[PDB]
């Protein structure tokens, strides 16, 4: 699949599972159309979001819900979320893996992009 | 002031300077409506953006350009901008520290009294 | 493998390749004792740094030398090395990822640990 | 003072607060000599660590004692330590950020003149 998404959670040193992931992308008209979701599986990850055909040259944004996450750890975070917005397939098509890397007051995200 | 962003480039190792700032505060139709914005310091400082009085209770966005900050250095981003939404709570001061590379950025709060 | 070091470039957004790693087990002496060593495939993964058998309780020292790999792509980075330090199987025997993130000034390291 | 180091907590937001930070200069021999040290303030910074005539150039350690400092907080943590090594190289100030969770952590340096 084009687009994966990997949450770990740095306070268990785990993978985060059961963590929801909402992708959007931008339309002509500057909103934001959902474009699909999922929630990470026990090894973290959101596969099967989209496919090579249906993953067009656009601007892309993952919403991670890691509020929801935290909450149900009993922890009250900061963040509302953590959103990962990005220009994808603009030379060509591309495979990406979104990874984020939970905190309580803290995350951080990175892209692994690869040319298949 | 209540909210302070420093924003970090990774890449050279010294503040980020000149990033464009922008914050919104969620209004009641669930749009973000624009409430202060800047550019960084020689420090990678947003320095000044509300006050006590202004920054009431609600759900805010800092968006920081990092993509124009990248462009300046001749190097290729993917992010188009780096996004911090959280819940202003009622005394705190709230950091919001960015850490930037081409690829990845971090962003941590500090929240203190 | 019970012990995996993958290391990430968010310069490039790829998997750092070709990054030697080298591992260490603090002896009875308190001296650091050469465990394992290798380095990272196109993945950006070392694989099969020890057994099971091998890997015994103890305190690690896992040190992934990254100035050599920003230097070879024409970068001097801040750091001399990226060193990750940890006891190791205290509870039982766990599976260990050692992750690192690489920017020419900065680096972060997260542990992924598992019980097989 | 030309090397300062600030010591932040993600698990809660803060300033890690009585962190023990130990210096160490590489010496000729190849092993490390203790060069200064110090426990970080109520901002989470070690402050004083050493001098502008004292600090040459030369490979240096700092190491950051995060696992008392989590397990004061009656967390598991997973490193021993933090550890970060570096060349100084001739005017450059050294900053060193340290941002601490329990199985993570992060650091740069922002070097400035
Ligand atoms: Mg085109
Ligand atoms: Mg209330
Ligand atoms: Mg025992
Ligand atoms: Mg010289």
Chains 1, 3 share one sequence.
Do not use: Q
């Not at 306070?11 to 929801?20: D, T, Y």
């Not at 009993?74 to 939970?102: K, M, Q, W």
């Amino acid at each position: 699949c084009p687009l994966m998404v990997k949450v770990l959670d740095a306070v268990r040193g785990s993978p985060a599972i059961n963590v929801a992931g909402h992708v959007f992308r931008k339309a002509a008209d500057d909103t934001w159309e959902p474009f699909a979701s999922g929630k990470t599986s026990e090894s973290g990850e959101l596969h099967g979001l989209t496919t090579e055909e249906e993953f067009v040259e656009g601007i892309y944004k993952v919403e991670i819900d890691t509020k929801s996450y935290w909450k149900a750890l009993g922890i009250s975070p900061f963040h509302e979320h953590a959103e990962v917005v990005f220009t994808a397939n603009d030379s060509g098509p591309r495979r990406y893996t979104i990874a984020a890397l939970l905190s309580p007051y803290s995350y951080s995200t990175t892209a692994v992009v690869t040319n298949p």
